[PDB]
Amino acid sequence: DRFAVSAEAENKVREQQPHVERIFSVGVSVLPKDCPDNPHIWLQLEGPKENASRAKEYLKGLCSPELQDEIHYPPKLHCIFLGAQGFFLDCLAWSTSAHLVPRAPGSLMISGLTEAFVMAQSRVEELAERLSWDFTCTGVLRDFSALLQSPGDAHREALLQLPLAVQEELLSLVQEAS
């Protein structure tokens, strides 16, 4: 299956191409235009149909976002979006097809089609809510420790010091993405 986007947004497609490949594990191909004055370009996505559907929605949303806005949360939750070299952000982008850009600590720019923005907002809200489910280092799930073994990671500490409820949701997100 193929689909079209604005020719004026080809620049965007190419900037994001590697991230799209990494996140959805797909190939992005742009077809040559049949005429120069064409307002659209056709894309073809290479990979499993699941991966491709999600990439499609990401790319549509990237090229002309139906929603673009900052979500706001406790600054101490910001490590989740920067830690493990962006692994969690990637898993969240996978699960929602939203384009996600960390801003100030406690601020995340979410962007894409509307159903993608709301589902990402929702998931980010849930994480934030679960920070309040602290009932106090202070405890770590084995499987969570397991993902964060990459020693250089500068947000490794902050992540480990997250309460177990946030850790469990992050596991659930990673599990969803694999």
Residue numbers in the entry: 12 to 147, 157 to 198
Article excerpt on this structure:
Zinc finger antiviral protein (ZAP) binds CpG dinucleotides in viral RNA and targets them for decay. ZAP interacts with several cofactors to form the ZAP antiviral system, including KHNYN, a multidomain endoribonuclease required for ZAP-mediated RNA decay. KHNYN contains three structural domains, an N-terminal KH domain, a PilT N-terminal (PIN) nuclease domain, and a C-terminal CUElike domain (also known as a CUBAN domain) that binds ubiquitin and NEDD8 (18, 21, 22, 23). Here, we demonstrate that the KHNYN amino-terminal extended-diKH (ex-diKH) domain is required for antiviral activity and present its crystal structure.
The asymmetric unit contains two copies of the ex-diKH domain. In each copy, the domain spans residues 12 to 198 and is composed of an N-terminal type 1 KH module (KH1, residues 12–74), a short linker (residues 75 and 76), a second type 1 KH module (KH2, residues 77–144), a longer linker (residues 145–161) and a C-terminal bundle (CTB) extension composed of three alpha helices (residues 162–198). Inspection of the domain packing within the protein revealed a substantial interdomain interface that packs KH1 onto KH2. At the center of the interface, these include hydrophobic packing of KH1 side chains I34, F35, Y69, and L73 with A104, H110, L124, and A127 of KH2. These are accompanied by surrounding salt bridges and hydrogen bonding between R33 and D101, R65 and the mainchain carbonyl of S106 and between Y69 and H110, with R33 also π-stacking with W105. Additionally, the CTB extension packs onto the KH2 domain making an interface stabilized by multiple interactions between CTB α8 and KH2 α5, including a salt bridge network between E196 and R134, R134 and E189 and R141, as well as hydrogen bonding between R141 and the carbonyl of the mainchain A185. The computed Complex Formation Significance Score of 0.0 also suggested that the interface is unlikely to have biological relevance. This conclusion is supported by solution size-exclusion chromatography coupled to multiangle laser light scattering (SEC-MALLS) data that revealed that the ex-diKH domain was exclusively monomeric over the range of concentrations tested (0.5–8 mg/ml). Therefore, the dimer observed in the crystal likely is a result of crystal packing rather than any residual assembly associated with an ex-diKH domain homo-oligomerization function. Further analysis of the interresidue contacts in the ex-diKH crystal structure identified exposed arginine residues, R33 and R65, that make salt bridges and cation–π stacking interactions at the edge of the KH1-KH2 cleft that potentially could form part of a protein binding site.
